[PDB]
Structures are given as C-alpha cells and as structure tokens.
Design a protein around this motif. Structure first.
Motif, PDB file in Angstrom:
ATOM      1  N   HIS A  50       0.743  -1.134   0.048  1.00 21.02           N
ATOM      2  CA  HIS A  50      -0.051  -0.032   0.062  1.00 21.02           C
ATOM      3  C   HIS A  50       0.960   1.292   0.171  1.00 21.02           C
ATOM      4  O   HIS A  50       1.719   1.308   0.938  1.00 21.02           O
ATOM      5  N   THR A  97       3.712  -5.788   3.518  1.00 30.16           N
ATOM      6  CA  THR A  97       3.606  -6.688   4.503  1.00 30.16           C
ATOM      7  C   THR A  97       4.315  -8.081   3.988  1.00 30.16           C
ATOM      8  O   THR A  97       3.938  -8.566   3.068  1.00 30.16           O
ATOM      9  N   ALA A 113     -13.872  -3.092  11.142  1.00 26.56           N
ATOM     10  CA  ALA A 113     -12.717  -3.442  11.611  1.00 26.56           C
ATOM     11  C   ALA A 113     -11.832  -2.462  12.175  1.00 26.56           C
ATOM     12  O   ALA A 113     -11.827  -1.318  11.915  1.00 26.56           O
ATOM     13  N   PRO A 116      -8.443  -0.434  13.537  1.00 24.63           N
ATOM     14  CA  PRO A 116      -7.374  -0.352  12.837  1.00 24.63           C
ATOM     15  C   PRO A 116      -6.082  -1.083  13.695  1.00 24.63           C
ATOM     16  O   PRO A 116      -5.966  -0.937  14.872  1.00 24.63           O
ATOM     17  N   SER A 117      -5.369  -1.346  12.680  1.00 21.26           N
ATOM     18  CA  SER A 117      -3.828  -1.903  13.224  1.00 21.26           C
ATOM     19  C   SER A 117      -2.856  -0.890  12.874  1.00 21.26           C
ATOM     20  O   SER A 117      -2.683  -0.244  11.677  1.00 21.26           O
ATOM     21  N   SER A 161      -3.975   0.863   9.034  1.00 27.11           N
ATOM     22  CA  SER A 161      -4.198   0.045   8.108  1.00 27.11           C
ATOM     23  C   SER A 161      -5.287  -1.006   8.577  1.00 27.11           C
ATOM     24  O   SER A 161      -5.564  -0.954  10.095  1.00 27.11           O
ATOM     25  N   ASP A 162      -6.078  -1.445   7.575  1.00 31.74           N
ATOM     26  CA  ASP A 162      -7.209  -2.354   7.776  1.00 31.74           C
ATOM     27  C   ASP A 162      -8.163  -2.109   8.702  1.00 31.74           C
ATOM     28  O   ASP A 162      -8.526  -2.669   9.740  1.00 31.74           O
ATOM     29  N   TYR A 176     -12.431  -0.161   9.082  1.00 31.19           N
ATOM     30  CA  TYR A 176     -13.689   0.213   8.540  1.00 31.19           C
ATOM     31  C   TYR A 176     -14.558   0.576   9.403  1.00 31.19           C
ATOM     32  O   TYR A 176     -14.483  -0.188  10.359  1.00 31.19           O
ATOM     33  N   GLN A 178      -7.632   0.588   0.507  1.00 27.48           N
ATOM     34  CA  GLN A 178      -6.473  -0.439   0.320  1.00 27.48           C
ATOM     35  C   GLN A 178      -7.011  -1.078  -0.815  1.00 27.48           C
ATOM     36  O   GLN A 178      -8.034  -1.074  -1.583  1.00 27.48           O
ATOM     37  N   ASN A 200      -7.656  -4.486  -0.762  1.00 30.57           N
ATOM     38  CA  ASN A 200      -8.817  -5.320   0.089  1.00 30.57           C
ATOM     39  C   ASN A 200      -9.948  -4.424   0.446  1.00 30.57           C
ATOM     40  O   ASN A 200     -10.709  -5.112   1.321  1.00 30.57           O
ATOM     41  N   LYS A 254     -10.573  -2.370   2.480  1.00 29.19           N
ATOM     42  CA  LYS A 254     -10.388  -1.801   3.879  1.00 29.19           C
ATOM     43  C   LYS A 254      -9.575  -0.206   3.581  1.00 29.19           C
ATOM     44  O   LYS A 254      -8.884  -0.022   2.655  1.00 29.19           O
ATOM     45  N   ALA A 300      -6.843   2.764   5.002  1.00 26.18           N
ATOM     46  CA  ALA A 300      -5.625   3.088   5.517  1.00 26.18           C
ATOM     47  C   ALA A 300      -5.381   4.608   5.707  1.00 26.18           C
ATOM     48  O   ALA A 300      -5.642   5.268   4.906  1.00 26.18           O
TER      49      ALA A 300
END
Lengths: 261, 214
Positions: free
Chosen positions: A209, A228, B114, B116-117, B140-141, B143, B170, B172, B174, B176
């Motif tokens: 990303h 990653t 989701a 966030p990480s 990231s990741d 929603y 992103q 996927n 999701k 970021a």
C-alpha cells in the motif's frame, strides 16, 4: 493493445506554454480520433479538444483561444499546447481515443440532399428540387471516450523541482504481527507530485500500500509505502523499494534491512 | 458546460443505487450519453456509451437509461469495489465538443467493521545521521474510513509538526491512513517516549516508541 502514453513536463511556470505529446499504439492514428481531457484537483473532468482521422480539430469553446492540437500520422503522435498557463491549469492531462459521429436524419418523405445527388437539408420531392418541401434535418451528436491514457500530472508553479530522499522503515519486534511483519520506505521532501513506489521490481504486489502524499508547510511533499511480508523471511529475503519521481527523472532503490531487535 | 450530478450517493452491499445526470436539449437531450468510472489511483474507465450500450468487460449490473434531459446510471448488486467517482458526458452541438457532469462519489455501506492496526516507526538511523527525525505512524485495515490521530510526547499532547493524510482505500477494500511527526534529533532524544494515538468507532489504539529503545 490500444495504448496511449502522455509525455511532457511535469512542472511549468506561470505564463509559459504547456506542450504535451501523446504516443499511440494498437490502432491506426489516421483512422481514429484522439482527444485530450484534464481534471484539476477536486474538480470535474474538462474536455479540451480532439483531432479526427481527417485532421480536423474541435476544441472546448471556452478555452479555444489558448489551445492547439496537431498530429503526425507517420509518427503515431498527437500534440497539445496550452498557452499562458496559470495555477488553474494544474491538472492531470489524459490522452484518449474518442468515437465521434454526426447524424442528420430526415422524416418520412423528406430526403437528404446529399443522398439525391442546401446539401445538408431535407427535401420531400427530389424531382421538384425547386418547388420541393424542405426542412431542417434532425441532428444528433455522438461522442464518447473509448480508451483512456494513464494521465500526466502537470503542476503550474514558480517553485523549483526537488528530487526525493528515501529512508527505510525497518521492521523490528515492535513492527511484527506474529507471522507477518510490516516494512516500508519514507519518501521525503520532493516537488512536485507524483511519486510511485514498487517493491522488488514489481515481483512483490500482495500486501503493498502506497499512501497519498502530504503537503508540508515547507511546500514539499512526503509519502510512505508499506509492504507486509512473512516475519520468518526477514533474515534471508532482501526487500527493496523502488521509488519513481518522473518530474526530476529520478529513480531510487532502497534496501530495507531488519533491525537487531 | 457542466452536467448536474448529485455530489454523493450511498447504498448498502448487494442493494441498488441510481446516479442521475441532468442537462439540456443540446447535450443530454440530444440522446447519446456516456458514463465513466474513476477509481482513486487509476485511469478513468468507460462503462456506458450511447445511453444504454455497455462497454466490453463492464458487468451487466451497470446499466444506463435516459429520459429526456436526464440520464441515469443504475448500479445493482452493489459491491465494495464499486466505490468510485462517476461522471456522465455527452456531445454539445458538435461531435468534437464534450461536456462532463460534476461527478458523483459512490459510498457502499454495510461492509464489515474492522479496528485499525497501528505501526509506529521511529526515525531511522539514516535520517538521524542527516540531522533530521520523522516519526511515521501507519494505520491500516480499518472500516469505516474515519479515524482521529493524536500525538503525545511522554504524556502531553503534541500539536505542532504533525501531518495526517485522509484515509483512502487499500487493495482489500479496507481503509488506510498515515500520520507524521517531524522533530529535530534533539527533540527526539529529549523526551522519554512518543506515542501515536488512533481513535476509531469507540476504540483507541496507541503505539509508543522510545529513543532509548531499539
């Protein structure tokens, strides 16, 4: 295989002339129309103009005085010039292939004069031609963009170009998520946009990303790209971030090595 | 000159959404409307041409229609990948003169939430040897794509030197985001720790780095 590649300067000073070129492949340039479209940041798409197979050009009426479009069939190239550019001309510029067709239809009984040997007018009785009932044809204009180029970002500014500095974002124990680990590169202090980043020459696409740039108060941009990877591969596999900054004709490869912790 | 589109339209997953495009008799009313899809970070894609004809590769859940001076793009079986900007277009008094709509941003609701990480990178050794220091906080990741980011020095808030990007999608589907804290190498070694604090949907994730730590 229809491909369109815009080329030209990424940075132009105000009042100067912006000249762009479009190189084509996958279709006969002498049998298809090619057009230019632009989009300013946050604004809507704006038609600039086109040139067709016969070499005739049509322009946006509000911008016609500043625009020039030419082409060379034998070189597979189409040009675009925008004179006296200001900040309002900063935009992504797209080369396109365009379907163009004008239809002139007549009602029943009336016949178009181009058919019966005011050539673009209808006529009820082609035998009369003098005492014939005549009307204006129903004209419909067809235009749609078929293929789009990737676009060339053009920034109009009096500031100077600056290549980027690339720093590693090395993974550690505070960067792992068990089986996966995040690593990246910080692309700092460049001007103007854009910057693109790939990983391992494009062999690494899953988990990548690239974040949008941020505009610092210094007037320069910065962004980051993260990927990653499996944590077990940090010792053996080498990871390299490929930074591309066309405005300064700069390419940077930065090896990201893991930290001891 | 500019056709009239709604600024934003919303729909849930699997549902149906219609995007309108209003013009006059000299463009939309002339009867040959096209539709284009712009995904962030991608070139535009032609979806519809000639009011209803579908371009090759466009799924049949995209459909166009026109009634007088108003054209409509209908998207059914709404998927997350449909989130994009949508523009209509047509000729105006010439087959070499195009006018576009003002654009519509499509948001697809009802996607899995989701948390966030967060990953916080300290200033790299290379940047420090250049007398510069930037802390990079990658988010990231998550929603939905709405987070608030705050920075702390030891335990007090930090307002100056912070730059934060708007969350974007992103690969996927999701979201970021990124945030930066610019410091001098002296400020970096001055305090005992720095923190990146991210709030999202009644949840707060905080990452901490220390100049005395690897």
């Amino acid at each position: 295989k229809v491909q369109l590649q815009e080329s030209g300067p990424s940075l132009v000073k105000p009042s100067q002339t912006l000249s762009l070129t479009c190189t084509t492949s996958g279709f006969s340039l002498s049998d298809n129309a090619v057009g230019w479209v632009r989009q300013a940041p946050g604004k809507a798409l704006e038609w600039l103009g086109s040139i067709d197979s016969g070499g005739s050009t049509g322009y946006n009426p509000g911008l016609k005085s500043r625009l020039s479009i030419t082409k060379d069939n034998s070189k597979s190239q189409v040009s675009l010039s925008v004179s006296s550019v200001t900040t309002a001309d900063s935009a992504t510029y797209y080369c396109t292939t365009v379907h163009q067709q004008t239809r002139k239809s007549c009602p029943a009984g009336y016949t178009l004069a181009k058919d019966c040997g005011g050539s673009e007018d209808c006529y009820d009785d082609c035998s009369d031609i003098l005492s014939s009932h005549t009307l204006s044809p129903t004209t419909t204009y067809e235009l749609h963009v078929d293929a789009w180029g990737q676009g060339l970002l053009v920034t109009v500014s009096s500031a100077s170009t600056k290549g980027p500095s690339v720093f590693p974002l090395a993974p550690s124990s505070k960067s792992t998520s068990g089986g996966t680990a995040a690593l990246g590169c910080l692309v700092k202090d460049y001007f103007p946009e854009p910057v693109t980043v790939s990983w391992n020459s494009g062999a690494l696409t899953s988990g990548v990303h690239t974040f949008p740039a941020v505009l610092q108060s210094s007037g320069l941009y910065s962004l980051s790209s993260v990927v990653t990877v499996p944590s077990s591969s940090l010792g053996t596999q080498t990871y390299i971030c490929n930074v591309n900054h066309k405005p300064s004709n700069t390419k940077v490869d930065k090896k990201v090595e893991p930290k001891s912790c | 000159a500019v056709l009239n589109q709604p600024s934003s339209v919303s729909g849930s997953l699997g549902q149906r959404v219609s995007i309108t495009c209003s013009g006059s008799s000299s463009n939309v009313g002339n009867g040959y409307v096209s539709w284009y899809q712009l995904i962030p970070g991608s070139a535009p894609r032609t979806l519809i041409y000639g009011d209803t004809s579908r371009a090759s590769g466009v799924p049949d859940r995209f459909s166009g229609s026109r009634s007088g001076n108003t054209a409509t793009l209908t998207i059914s079986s709404l998927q997350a990948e449909d989130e994009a900007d949508y523009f209509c277009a047509s000729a105006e008094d010439s087959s070499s003169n195009a006018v576009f709509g003002s654009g519509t941003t499509l948001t697809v609701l009802g996607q899995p939430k989701a948390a966030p990480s967060v990953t916080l990178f300290p200033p790299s050794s290379e940047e420090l040897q250049a007398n510069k220091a930037t802390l990079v906080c990658l988010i990231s990741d998550f929603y939905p794509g709405a987070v608030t980011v705050a920075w702390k020095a030891d335990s007090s808030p930090v307002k100056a030197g912070v730059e934060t990007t708007t969350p974007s999608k992103q690969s996927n589907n999701k979201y970021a985001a990124s945030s930066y804290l610019s410091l001098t190498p002296e400020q970096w070694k001055s305090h005992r720790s720095y923190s990146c604090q991210v709030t999202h949907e009644g949840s707060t994730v905080e990452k901490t780095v220390a100049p005395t730590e690897c």
